[PDB]
């Protein structure tokens, strides 16, 4: 038998175990709230032709008055946020932010550190394993939409087993041509273009007839608890920014194309319920990072 698995699900590196208490969670929420004020003040400065709104918001964020000839980087708050982000990603990243600094910054604004008020939908498709017989070939590409190409060269029809895990809520399967899919020890239905599946139902068997290849497109949706301030567009932009600046360049870590891939990969690993809590705080931190750098750019 041959086994094929999704690339992004393979070997999730351990996430950090620091800065996950209530005090640190308050600091991340405070940074996100203050970063949003920073980006709005810069818009107001443009519309009013006056630097007062921006200097006003930068002082709260950086605890310092902007001075000419000195580069505006965000002050001590930017230093803490950038280094805390690195620790969340990997356990090999050092913890270098003192507790006195976290407590001081968390007191700047009043806000809750709650990270389970709301929910969000993530579209990464988990294909844990695809088991195929000897005379068949199976290829899996894509994360948001997974295309599984299957070719049968044997004499008769073959059965391919699909395992979508236990975490995803719904999986929608669309085929290039009508195909038959059923659960284990269940009679096969008539050929259909689309299938709506529950991953908890069990392994799924697909009949692959001899002839032209059959391509199955998979889309998945999962629910993860997130704070109300979560914004998927802002989190994804921050993830690419953190990658470009090199904050995620740590030894023995795995790289993902999107935050959707990163959070799903950690969810499907062992002790994934504990990992996903740390990833949520990282997403809020990346949202603050994205808004901070867009307000204060460097060429």
């Amino acid at each position: 038998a041959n086994r094929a698995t999704s690339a992004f699900l393979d070997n999730p590196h351990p996430v950090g175990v620091n800065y996950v208490d209530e005090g640190s969670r308050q600091f991340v929420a405070v940074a996100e709230l203050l970063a949003s004020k920073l980006i709005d003040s810069s818009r107001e400065s443009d519309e009013s032709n006056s630097d007062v709104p921006f200097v006003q918001a930068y002082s709260k964020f950086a605890d310092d008055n902007p001075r000419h000839l000195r580069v505006k980087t965000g002050g001590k708050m930017a230093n803490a946020l950038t280094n805390v982000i690195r620790s969340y990603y990997s356990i090999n990243a050092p913890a270098i932010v003192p507790q006195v600094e976290i407590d001081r910054l968390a007191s700047k604004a009043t806000v809750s550190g709650d990270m389970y008020n709301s929910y969000a939908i993530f579209n990464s498709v988990p294909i844990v394993e695809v088991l195929s017989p000897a005379r068949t070939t199976v290829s899996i590409v894509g994360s948001d939409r997974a295309d599984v190409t299957m070719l049968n060269t044997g004499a008769g029809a073959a059965n391919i087993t699909f395992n979508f895990g236990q975490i995803a809520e719904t999986v929608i399967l669309k085929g290039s041509v009508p195909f038959q899919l059923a659960r284990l020890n269940q009679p096969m239905p008539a050929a259909r273009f689309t299938y709506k599946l529950r991953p908890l139902d069990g392994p799924f068997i697909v009949v692959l007839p001899v002839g032209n290849p059959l391509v199955i497109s998979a889309t998945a949706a999962t629910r993860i608890q997130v704070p109300l301030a979560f914004n998927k567009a802002l989190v994804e932009s921050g993830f690419q920014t953190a990658m470009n600046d090199g904050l995620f360049d740590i030894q023995n870590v795995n790289y993902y194309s999107s935050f959707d891939e990163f959070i799903i990969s950690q969810y499907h690993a062992q002790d994934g319920i504990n990992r996903v809590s740390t990833c949520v705080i990282l997403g809020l931190a990346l949202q603050a990072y994205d808004q901070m750098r867009r307000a204060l750019p460097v060429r």
Binding site: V17, N18, D21, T73, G74, A78, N79, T82, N83, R86, A93, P94, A95, I96, Q99, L247, D249, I250
Partner: peptide
């Protein structure tokens, strides 16, 4: 607090 292992060569961010 768990912290980290003492003697390690690391890269930190100083923007």
């Amino acid at each position: 607090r768990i912290g980290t292992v003492p003697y390690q060569n690391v890269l930190i961010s100083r923007n």
